[PDB]
Design a protein around this ligand. Structure first.
Ligand code: NA
Ligand code: NA
Ligand code: NA
Ligand code: NA
Ligand code: NA
Ligand code: NA
Ligand code: NA
Ligand code: NA
Ligand code: NA
Ligand code: NA
Ligand code: NA
Lengths: 171, 171, 171, 171, 171, 171, 171, 171, 171, 171, 171
């Protein structure tokens, strides 16, 4: 799995591959690992099972409403719940969320991390797409969308756990 | 074990073998691992114990009624419960359900997977039945029922955990 | 431990050895691992501790009453309870039950297995007794009672966890 | 640790060594691992910590009262509780109890075992004392008390986890 | 795999199945695991690879010639070599050899075992074929060949690693 | 990796994918894992390193010369050398060879296996290609060449260690 | 396995059971684990495979000849060889040897141990037979031979790895 | 560690970071992991200890001389030696070599791999530098040298086992 | 991560690096791991997730209020709550707090440690910063602020989990 | 095992216990683990097998001759031989030697250690005897002989691997 | 253990502690872990056994003479031998050598590391001594000898495996 988000020219674009692997066999190749939350204002990507992510996204949606759409506050509060709530604590997944100004990686270990760069990624192929994205951001004038398509494509080329069927969303 | 579902010409067929294994010994060769749910409109197969399957199918039936027969919604909600409910959380069977338009693999790990092809399978011999089904779907005009019959026979021939006693249900 | 059930010409016989092992030492050699339940119409054997067996058999007795002596129904409902009930879930014995027409292996993992043959067995020595039983069933005209005695003896001869002190019950 | 009980000439005698080991160092050499329960009518020995045994003995005392002093019934009921009660289930120890007519080994796994002989033993050195006791019972006319002293002494000689400071009680 | 030898009425017969398994898949179903050595006077079967078996049988043939056809001596000497020789020490197959009077199980661990019964077996399904053979030998007047045929069929039915394609040799 | 051989109506075809994986990253996607040996009469494929394969194929070539093109003899002698030779013993590739009449899987564990069917395969994706191949062989009139191409494609689609860049050789 | 030696009234008697176990199945029940060496003057027992013991006994025989029949010296020199010789060092077994005046336990770790008592034993059931032997030696006037028969019999009763078919030799 | 090689416009450039890590501490930050062989015509990079690499490079130099400067042949022959030579087989490292027309990754497992692209990399940070290099090669007109500097720099940013002190060589 | 506190001549300074590591990749390099609590009189740093830290610091703030700014009392009560509270028990961050007179390391294992020196540190790089800090405290006249900056730099230079982006707070 | 050496006022005394343990059973209680070497001028004790000790002591004797009784030189050269010699390298005993002026602990790992105090010890119980010895050396006027006896007794009292049967040698 | 080398003003100084630890007990506190080689022109320290160190230093001395005192060449060649030579390959000490211009850490894993700073260290406490040395070198004008003295004291204070008894050598 590879989820990548890139911000450039006031646009934030997030992409995700579509491969679902069980052991060493591909069960599905067109998975949609990127969704939209907060009334189409927040991008949300996930590395993990659908049900786990959905339950977490539900709690995240709630947090967004409760704290007036404050992404930073919502992310921290979700991390807290995910960490202590007996239910969510059993969920295994890694999240990547972002609006037009902030990006956060959130984990079940109480982590809320905003990389100090215009790009971030998670999943087994995350670092590959990220390296590519950082390269394109610093040496081309390509748009956020194009960088994501190209970086994700390169990640799929290298990682056996990530494919080339990329789904892209934007806010 | 091998459970295979094939969709063709608006018809959906599911087949399952009958072998039950404990360690290295075959305990039973005529198990029924396939049933019909949702008033005969849904096919359901399982890799696992009878009690686990029944407990899960009962919750699935409820999900179907609650969400107006929406297989996609019902599968997702069942997966969420399987992950949170302390009772279901102990059940370890692997499920395969389908109707005329969709197919879903559901696991106790919150996984809800719909392969992007007209065939899907679970169990130790699943991939063999699947490879055979794909080959037949793409190179013959055989019906969904004919393909399931022929694919299951091959899986039972290759996998030591799958036999040739097949039960078939159709919708 | 070896528990064996053989049915031949309307007669159903169950035999169990008496060896109780702790680590690598025999603590008792005359244990009774077989009994009659449901007003003398059901044969019940177990591979495990006596307290576990007693609690499970009591629940089985209740199921038999609630479902009007239906062995199949009773066995399935016991397995579902065994799998969901907070108390029973701690019980780890392996059970083998039979009446004049059906035979079921029941486990704490939700298993309810009826072998598709006229003999069934559980315990470390089960497979050996089963092999001997099938050989006699298919190549001699010996009665179920004789077969069980002879098969159990051979199992105790081969398995270090099974002895030759056999208890037999018939229905 | 070694706990041994021997019955001979209407007398039941139980002995236990006094060694308490932590890692490879002896912390105490005069431990009292044998107590009297049921108003001085039942002998009770234990391999394990004092607190664990005490809590179990308390529950055993209760069971004895509840079932009219029936040792067999009391032992089975304790085994059941020890197995399922969330509290006792956390206790780690092995028990050896006996009155003037019955002897039972009881474990946290629901086991209630009465050896088919006039002797029984538990603990790391149990089998050594037992072998000795069986030898003396079958080849001498020594009293139960003397057999216990000699057998325990031999166990202490052989096992590094059992010493020669023997405490003996009788009913 | 299952290799069974039965001695009866001065006649010795050895049978072997034909299944070859890699992981969970059957690679071949008609393997020949039984041969004749020592000028047609010795039966030899193996659980393991062809190259290993052949290398071992060649050394065994030499041992037979050297010790004047003494199966007992030849088996012991082969076992010693298998244990010391750096070349043979790498071979891991399990062997079963027999003539009109003796039977020996030989392993690379210096084991040379002659069971004290007129039947012996090796391989994953050996004990099942053995239990069946013992039952038939003690309850029928069937020949060594008939018993091997019937016992092997049963072993192949129970063991997922043994099939029904049997090769039989006799001396 | 997937190497597949299919024989139909006198034509023998071998196909192999081109993916080279190190850990979880693809290092090359156009590898040649199939070649012709013995003056163009023998098909040879391998799952492993190229240096291992070259050394083994060279020894195989020698065996073919020494035994006058006898594939069976050559395969067996190669396996014996592979198992005993101090040099070859360090080689861990898995081989698959075939001529116009025979097919053999050869391993460093002394295995020499000829499947009893008109198709054989090795490598992580072998079973999938095999299942697809058998399905097409038994339910279509497609040639060996077409079957291999189609089966290899399906194997690369399912297995994350096998890609779709196929090399084919025929005899 | 259980090997026991007892000295009393100028007579040294050594006994051994006959059970040979592979996993949890008895392959042979009349094994002869006690031999005579040094021209019928030295008793030699072994826990381990036949070939290993034989090779060690051969080297022991040699040592006895070399050092003029000095059992003590022969045992020490064998221990040295067993420890350093590349061949013997691969042998896995435990030995128990004795003449009319000395008893020694010898291991592949360079151990040569003479217990300070008139009895010694090795094997899984060794301590059980030893405890019994010590009991009979100190409380009866039974002969060495009878003590061995009774102690071994008791060991077979307790240990699942030792049986009641005892072979006895004397010097 | 990260070693990257890029070919563009008839120029082949190889770079390597300078970090040497022991546990979780940096012992050196200006390591030179890239050398020149074959009379300054071949680039050679290594992930592993200095001595191991040096010994391998020595053998590689020899192979280059022996086969007339044929990089492909030299690499294969080194792989063979590294695989079987008792000395080299003990060496633990991964190599990356290249001239102006070919690039090869060589391992101690007999692997000789030429990626099908104008870039290749090894070491823990290899895939990160590679992803970046592939991005720059396909979307900019930067020289091989600049791509290497930028890609390596990005790898150092991401991987904790790779730093920013890059050594670059060219042929 | 490295968090360091140094006190010299009434001045207490705390510094923390900014590297956030997931596995072996740096996700962020400018994290703020140090803050001021208790109305600007308490320095607080942490090695762990931000959500864990926030929850713990909030509880610490409460303790400070309840115990009238008594750092010792507050630290001890926080540790007791951390150890017993069902919520906090899931929090695994390591804390370091200090005011103008005391310094305490607090963990989820009930630890409350005040080093007996004028410097303290936590995190993977703590010991390195501590060593450097003590060296400067004892052999120079540098202020606490200068020492922290210099020590933190050296820690980031040696530890792969600590970087050079330092945040400093003083009281 | 415990071996202790104490030197006080020109007198050097070495004591060793006599317990020999195999697993968790005492096989002998009167072993001699201490001897005199170098014409009665060197005290030598060991924790290990007797064969290992004898071979090592013989080599030590040779070193003492070759280096003119220089204990330091002899101990170092023995350690170097122990570490490089193909034979000695298989020996795993731990040695303790001393003369009227020096004391050395020698191991197969090349260790040559002379404690900087007037007492030294090896074996599982060494530290206990050492603690007791130092206490008596520093707070009483007891002789070396008395101290060793008293310290060894206390060590045997605390350690389950050390008994109270002490052998003493003096120089 | 802690061995530290510091170069300053053309003077090179190496210091080492004297603690020797076995398990959790200090066996000696005045060990000499630092020596002078190459006619007093080279400093050599070690973390490991005396025999190992001496054997390695002897080979190092030879390397120095052979390569005309070239420390860099000698270190590399020693590392190669340590890796190939069957005798040295068993030595496991860690080495630290230096002269007026260079410093090298040498390991049995073929590692030859020269840190890019005027200080280096090995052993459990190395990093602490190193952090202290770097701090002093960059913030004072203290000599190499003064810094080593002060840094070693600090390392001994922090590490439980390093003490305050330091030996210092200079060149
Ligand atoms: Na991919
Ligand atoms: Na099958
Ligand atoms: Na038995
Ligand atoms: Na004892
Ligand atoms: Na089968
Ligand atoms: Na693929
Ligand atoms: Na027994
Ligand atoms: Na880095
Ligand atoms: Na760092
Ligand atoms: Na003791
Ligand atoms: Na210290």
């Amino acid at each position: 799995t590879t989820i990548l988000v890139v911000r450039r020219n006031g646009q934030t674009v997030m992409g995700g591959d579509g491969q679902v692997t069980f052991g060493s066999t591909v069960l599905k190749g067109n998975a949609r690992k990127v969704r939209k939350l907060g009334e189409g204002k927040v991008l949300a990507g996930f590395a993990g099972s659908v049900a786990d992510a959905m339950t977490l996204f539900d709690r995240f949606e709630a947090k967004l409403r409760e704290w007036g759409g404050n992404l930073t506050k919502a992310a921290v509060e979700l991390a807290k719940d995910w960490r202590t709530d007996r239910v969510l604590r059993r969920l295994e997944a890694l999240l990547l969320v972002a609006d037009k100004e902030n990006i956060f990686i959130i984990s079940g270990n109480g982590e809320v991390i905003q990389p100090d760069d215009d790009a971030a990624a998670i999943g087994s192929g995350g670092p590959y797409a990220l390296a590519a994205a950082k390269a394109l951001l610093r040496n081309t004038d390509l748009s956020a969308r194009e960088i994501v398509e190209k970086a994700m494509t390169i990640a799929g080329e290298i990682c056996i756990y990530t494919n080339q069927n990329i789904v892209i969303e934007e806010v």
